[PDB]
Amino acid sequence: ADDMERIFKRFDTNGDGKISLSELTDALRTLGSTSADEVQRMMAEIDTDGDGFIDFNEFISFCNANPGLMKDVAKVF
Numbered sequence: 001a002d003d004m005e006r007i008f009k010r011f012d013t014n015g016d017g018k019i020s021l022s023e024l025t026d027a028l029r030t031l032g033s034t035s036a037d038e039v040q041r042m043m044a045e046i047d048t049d050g051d052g053f054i055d056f057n058e059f060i061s062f063c064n065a066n067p068g069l070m071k072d073v074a075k076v077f
């Protein structure tokens with residue numbers, strides 16, 4: 001039972017293997033996140049294909065990095 005799994009599936013409402021990393025940073029604004037601007041530049045780190053999608057390894061790399069964004073995000077997962 002992983003926490004990052006829930007959030008990862010949160011955006012994955014299309015039954016896909018990846019989730020848009022662009023809509024995330026822009027979506028966090030609704031979650032009440034005050035780092036939507038910092039997350040936008042952070043999500044780019046996990047993205048190695050610079051595409052509008054991220055897999056489990058990508059999304060995870062964000063948390064494993066402990067940047068300080070997913071810390072508060074996963075808290076409301």
Ligand SMILES: [Mg+2]
Nearest residue numbers: 047049053054
């Ligand atoms: Mg990617």
